[PDB]
Amino acid sequence: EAKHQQQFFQFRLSGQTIEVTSEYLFRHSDNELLHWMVALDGKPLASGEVPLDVAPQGKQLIELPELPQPESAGQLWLTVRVVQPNATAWSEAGHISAWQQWRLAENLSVTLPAASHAIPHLTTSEMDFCIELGNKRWQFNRQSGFLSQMWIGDKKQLLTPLRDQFTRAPLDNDIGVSEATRIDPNAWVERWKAAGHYQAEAALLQCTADTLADAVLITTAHAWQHQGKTLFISRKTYRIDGSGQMAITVDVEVASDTPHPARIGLNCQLAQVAERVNWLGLGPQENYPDRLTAACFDRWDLPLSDMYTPYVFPSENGLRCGTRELNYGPHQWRGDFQFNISRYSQQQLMETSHRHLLHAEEGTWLNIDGFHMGIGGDDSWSPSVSAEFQLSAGRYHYQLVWCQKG
Amino acid sequence: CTADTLADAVLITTAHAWQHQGKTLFISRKTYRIDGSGQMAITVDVEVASDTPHPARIGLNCQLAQVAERVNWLGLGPQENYPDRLTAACFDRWDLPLSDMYTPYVFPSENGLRCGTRELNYGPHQWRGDFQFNISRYSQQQLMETSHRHLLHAEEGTWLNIDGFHMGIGGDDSWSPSVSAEFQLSAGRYHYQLVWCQKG
Numbered sequence: 275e276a277k278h279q280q281q282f283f284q285f286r287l288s289g290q291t292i293e294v295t296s297e298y299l300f301r302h303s304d305n306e307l308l309h310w311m312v313a314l315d316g317k318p319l320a321s322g323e324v325p326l327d328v329a330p331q332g333k334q335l336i337e338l339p340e341l342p343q344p345e346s347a348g349q350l351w352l353t354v355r356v357v358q359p360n361a362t363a364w365s366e367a368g369h370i371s372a373w374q375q376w377r378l379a380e381n382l383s384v385t386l387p388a389a390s391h392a393i394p395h396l397t398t399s400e401m402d403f404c405i406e407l408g409n410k411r412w413q414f415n416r417q418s419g420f421l422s423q424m425w426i427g428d429k430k431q432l433l434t435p436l437r438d439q440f441t442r443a444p445l446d447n448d449i450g451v452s453e454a455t456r457i458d459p460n461a462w463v464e465r466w467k468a469a470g471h472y473q474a475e476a477a478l479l480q481c482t483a484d485t486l487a488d489a490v491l492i493t494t495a496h497a498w499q500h501q502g503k504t505l506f507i508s509r510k511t512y513r514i515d516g517s518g519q520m521a522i523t524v525d526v527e528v529a530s531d532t533p534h535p536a537r538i539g540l541n542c543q544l545a546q547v548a549e550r551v552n553w554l555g556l557g558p559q560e561n562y563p564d565r566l567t568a569a570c571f572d573r574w575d576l577p578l579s580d581m582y583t584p585y586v587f588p589s590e591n592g593l594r595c596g597t598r599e600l601n602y603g604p605h606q607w608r609g610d611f612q613f614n615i616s617r618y619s620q621q622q623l624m625e626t627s628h629r630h631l632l633h634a635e636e637g638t639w640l641n642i643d644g645f646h647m648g649i650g651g652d653d654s655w656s657p658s659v660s661a662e663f664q665l666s667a668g669r670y671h672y673q674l675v676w677c678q679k680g
Numbered sequence: 681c682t683a684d685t686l687a688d689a690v691l692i693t694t695a696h697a698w699q700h701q702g703k704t705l706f707i708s709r710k711t712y713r714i715d716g717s718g719q720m721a722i723t724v725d726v727e728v729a730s731d732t733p734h735p736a737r738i739g740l741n742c743q744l745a746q747v748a749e750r751v752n753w754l755g756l757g758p759q760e761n762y763p764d765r766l767t768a769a770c771f772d773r774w775d776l777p778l779s780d781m782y783t784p785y786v787f788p789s790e791n792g793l794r795c796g797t798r799e800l801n802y803g804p805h806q807w808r809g810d811f812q813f814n815i816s817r818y819s820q821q822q823l824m825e826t827s828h829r830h831l832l833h834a835e836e837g838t839w840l841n842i843d844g845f846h847m848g849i850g851g852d853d854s855w856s857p858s859v860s861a862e863f864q865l866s867a868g869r870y871h872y873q874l875v876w877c878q879k880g
Contacts, residue, residue, distance in 0.1 A: 349730060377730050377731070378731070379730075379731045380729050380730040380731055381704070381729075382697075382704040382707055382727055382729050384697045384704055384707065482687065484686045484687055486684045486691075487682065487684055491686075491691075525873075610869060662862075669810060671871040673725075
């Protein structure tokens with residue numbers, strides 16, 4: 275993020291014209307090459323290289339050729355980057371010094387899904403709702419109101435039920451100088467603890483299941499109360515269609531007098547451990563709502579080890595924002611969300627003092643958030659999350675689609 | 681457009697696309713849930729293309745057959761207010777005659793909006809949610825085509841515009857775009873819910 279904000283080349287896009295302004299005061303851009311690329315949802319469509327001839331503090335206007343205009347659905351992204359072909363005393367040949375990304379043109383998807391002939395079958399007991407479709411099967415706990423288990427064939431997919439999460443392992447900016455002796459009431463973590471966000475217990479309000487003409491509809495409503503006070507209300511809809519897909523719509527109400535929650539999303543512990551994490555979204559590196567400018571939208575494939583940031587004092591980490599599709603093993607999650615995936619739960623990160631004491635858990639912990647609070651950074655002893663990055667709207671909606679390899 | 685009977689309600693699902701010259705501008709997915717108590721829950725999800733200019737509003741409109749004398753709502757301000765001109769407004773229960781819900785600007789335009797409204801009552805109809813509304817006898821089409829306010833004529837019924845989201849108004853100057861980025865509808869995806877009930 276520091277490298278991107280400190281670039282010596284600034285970029286402006288106007289139609290098909292890229293304006294490059296040099297921030298150098300003395301040198302001419304004699305070791306600079308501009309590589310541009312246009313991709314559609316991570317699929318490259320066109321590319322080109324233009325040498326840079328910019329005087330100190332000057333501007334070079336670069337007219338792109340006729341860019342591709344795909345009729346397939348998706349967003350067009352234009353990425354430029356400055357490459358140094360020759361090695362310097364402080365850098366090697368091929369060094370990238372500056373980059374920028376834009377959205378070019380989006381074709382909204384209007385095509386309907388294929389008319390699947392099958393219908394998921396719903397069985398009702400006193401303890402659970404069971405939806406069965408082919409080899410796949412879902413189970414909803416009627417006492418808890420959460421999806422408890424999913425089976426592909428005879429293999430369980432979950433170790434922990436899929437539940438709403440409103441907290442994160444506190445960052446160093448969340449803690450401040452709030453020691454166990456000199457408590458800091460203004461610290462974010464102290465306000466969350468005093469409000470009971472870490473101790474709030476979910477209470478089921480309603481849970482119904484209806485069979486549609488082509489799907490199965492599951493509706494749940496939970497209330498998170500702490501000492502006779504409702505902090506959050508979550509209303510969730512599960513739509514299991516005949517194609518195997520699972521659409522999850524979540525509507526959340528947050529009390530205005532409680533401190534703004536750190537996140538609004540779901541979490542679960544997947545039984546499967548996989549080697550690669552593939553997602554279509556922002557950046558190869560971890561990024562957050564107020565630290566995502568350096569990240570780029572593309573198709574990224576990383577090993578699961580690179581999805582975890584080894585901070586000395588464990589905390590919430592590894593978040594990727596602006597993600598439209600996430601693939602892990604046989605599971606695919608689509609929507610507009612942020613996620614982090616690792617072998618350590620948020621509970622373990624909160625209780626472990628140093629990273630060398632962290633131990634991997636049995637499965638994979640996945641946190642998918644519709645919304646996430648920004649991180650601080652102006653200082654580390656006082657609250658420094660700006661108002662535009664706090665979760666203060668009061669009402670929140672997000673949708674998720676969960677499908678499999680079929 | 682599908683209709684399903686639930687255990688206690690009737691579910692209506694629709695999806696529309698707004699296209700102009702071979703290009704989809706907006707997609708609206710709407711859900712209607714008519715329960716046994718008489719209530720009508722309407723959930724709207726809207727997709728806006730990123731390359732099209734940001735829309736001025738995202739909501740619904742209809743012409744009610746009934747004309748009533750008083751407009752009662754629980755929301756912001758007695759006077760008209762907009763996303764970037766609502767600081768002076770106050771949240772309370774307001775009751776105004778329908779005439780005061782229209783602002784007589786010399787050159788007709790969109791007017792009379794009330795923001796931050798949780799409940800709106802007009803005749804036997806009640807609308808609940810988190811929305812902005814304007815109510816008057818002139819349609820948005822008539823306001824666009826009428827040069828001066830003295831040429832405005834009331835229509836047969838009442839025109840109601842309920843918006844989940846609304847673009848801010850300018851004011852820094854009148855010759856150049858002056859709506860700030862935080863008041864433009866640039867999110868791309870929008871959701872809002874409405875409940876429509878009656879006197880029962």
